[PDB]
Structure 1
Amino acid sequence: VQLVESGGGLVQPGGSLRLSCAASGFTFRNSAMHWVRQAPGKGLEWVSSIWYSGSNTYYADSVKGRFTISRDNSKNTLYLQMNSLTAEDTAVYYCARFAGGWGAYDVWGQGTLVTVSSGGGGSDIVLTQSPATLSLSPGERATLSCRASQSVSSNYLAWYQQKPGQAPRLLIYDSSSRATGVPARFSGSGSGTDFTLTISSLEPEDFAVYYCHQYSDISPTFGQGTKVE
């Protein structure tokens, strides 16, 4: 009793790939066949299922509309056509015979790696903000840090304020330039790889999420934000 997988490989986002699984040693044409995948360093996730003629094929919500399970009982082969692939589809894909109360997934294919990527990565300057959270009171000082993995040329670093449900608002650009209409209690400083945003005396309207942003190259990146609550 065996399941021989083939296919997979490295593909670009939006591309297509077909997986196949050739069965032997059991009455394949009667067996329910599933596909299961496992993202790198993650757990098992059911993908799709197919059974006898007269039954519904089933899909996971992530793939419904993009993947197609099929079978050719004349070749004892199971297929998975994967369209509109994105980096979240990167996983090892297993074919498996489903025996339900008679063995669950009792036979597994060996699994094939499907990696969907456009060439990353990468050279991107990584921005790390600290701390993730600051609990303060009105009138107190807020000091926020942004550290870059590489030097930010021309100190092209900006700071944004974002309140819930609203678009980000420019506070500081060119590391130290306070934008027009921004109160003087906001000030930015630093150079190279070490930048700081200081709110001298917090007001009740200053409690929000703050992002740093480097625009010194063709691959703009943001920090993950510091929440001031």
Structure 2
Amino acid sequence: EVQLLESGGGLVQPGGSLRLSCAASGFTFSSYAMSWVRQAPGKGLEWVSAISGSGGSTYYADSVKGRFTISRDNSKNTLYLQMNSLRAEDTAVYYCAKGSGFDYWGQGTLVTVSSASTKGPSVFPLAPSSKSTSGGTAALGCLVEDYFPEPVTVSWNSGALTSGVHTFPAVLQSSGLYSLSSVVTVPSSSLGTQTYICNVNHKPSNTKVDEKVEPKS
């Protein structure tokens, strides 16, 4: 069975170096050209680099030219990508891909280039009021900000409230920190009777926050 297993991904600072590797099995490695393809969070596929079966010919996207080096060790069935002078824009999942018309892909390895240091979030309630009451339904939420790296998990009433919950994708701010919001719609008659708490967990920083969302007038 054909297998491609990527490794070497993780947190790195701009200007820093990282070496990704891809261990191949299930085929004569030296008979195929290999590529690296990346995908920024929420974006499209971007081809990065390719190498011939022998390693005699290397190819690069203009965006990585002079900074990245693709190589292979045919005696070890391993493909490499030496990434130097890393930039925030190089943040992506990096896939190892086999051949011309990529029939096999690895599971990918996440690379996060950032000058930010690991930090837990700040949580701000989005209180229900007449301004967030549409008919007999009220909306309430929590703004989750200033954290790094992704992800945060948000639950409502320790997982007991799941109906009508919408947690938005994180947005990277100029600070290098992320922000998101989580909202929930509930019967307006439940306000002041049912307690609504958003539970924010940020495993990278070992932090957890509970925010009781109180109705306004």
Measured against the shorter chain, the TM-score band is 0.5 to 0.7
**Who is 1:212 aligned against?**
none
- Stretches (4+) displaced over 4 A: none
Task: Say whether the 8 Å CA contact 2:55–2:71 is kept in structure 1.
Answer: no
SS at match of 1:42: coil
The 5 Å alignment of 1:3-14 reads 3-14=4-15
The 5 Å alignment of 1:17-32 reads 17-32=18-33
Q: How far off its partner does 1:55 sit?
A: 4.3
**TM-score, reference length from structure 1:** 0.50
Q: How far off its partner does 1:121 sit?
A: 9.8
**Who is 2:109 aligned against?**
112
**Who is 2:87 aligned against?**
86
**Who is 1:35 aligned against?**
36
- RMSD after superposition: 1.9
Task: Say whether the 8 Å CA contact 2:55–2:72 is kept in structure 1.
Answer: no
- CA distance change for structure 1 residues 13 and 106 in 2, over 3 Å: closer, same or farther? same
> What CA distance in whole angstroms lies between the structure 2 residues aligned with 1:54 and 1:29?
9
> What CA distance in whole angstroms lies between the structure 1 residues aligned with 2:71 and 2:65?
14
Q: How far off its partner does 1:53 sit?
A: 3.0
* Greater mean deviation of Cα atoms: 12-21 or 44-53: 44-53
Identity percentage over the alignment?
82
> What CA distance in whole angstroms lies between the structure 2 residues aligned with 1:25 and 1:64?
31
Structure 2 letter corresponding to 1:85: L
> What CA distance in whole angstroms lies between the structure 1 residues aligned with 2:79 and 2:41?
24
Q: How far off its partner does 1:54 sit?
A: 7.3
**TM-score, reference length from structure 2:** 0.52
> What CA distance in whole angstroms lies between the structure 1 residues aligned with 2:53 and 2:74?
10
Q: How far off its partner does 1:120 sit?
A: 6.9
> What CA distance in whole angstroms lies between the structure 2 residues aligned with 1:54 and 1:32?
8
- CA distance change for structure 1 residues 121 and 10 in 2, over 3 Å: closer, same or farther? closer
- CA distance change for structure 1 residues 121 and 77 in 2, over 3 Å: closer, same or farther? closer
| Bigger CA radius of gyration | 1
Q: How far off its partner does 1:56 sit?
A: 2.0
Deviations 1:33-62 (A, max 9, x none): 000000011000000000133742100000
* Greater mean deviation of Cα atoms: 46-55 or 13-22: 46-55
> What CA distance in whole angstroms lies between the structure 2 residues aligned with 1:85 and 1:115?
10
> What CA distance in whole angstroms lies between the structure 2 residues aligned with 1:69 and 1:121?
30
- CA distance change for structure 1 residues 109 and 13 in 2, over 3 Å: closer, same or farther? same
**Who is 1:171 aligned against?**
none
> What CA distance in whole angstroms lies between the structure 2 residues aligned with 1:2 and 1:85?
28
> What CA distance in whole angstroms lies between the structure 1 residues aligned with 2:56 and 2:115?
38
Structure 2 residues without counterparts, runs of 5 or longer: 120-174, 176-217
SS at match of 1:105: coil
Deviations 1:7-66 (A, max 9, x none): 110001100000000000001011110000000110000000001337421000000000
- CA distance change for structure 1 residues 43 and 120 in 2, over 3 Å: closer, same or farther? farther
Structure 2 letter corresponding to 1:63: V
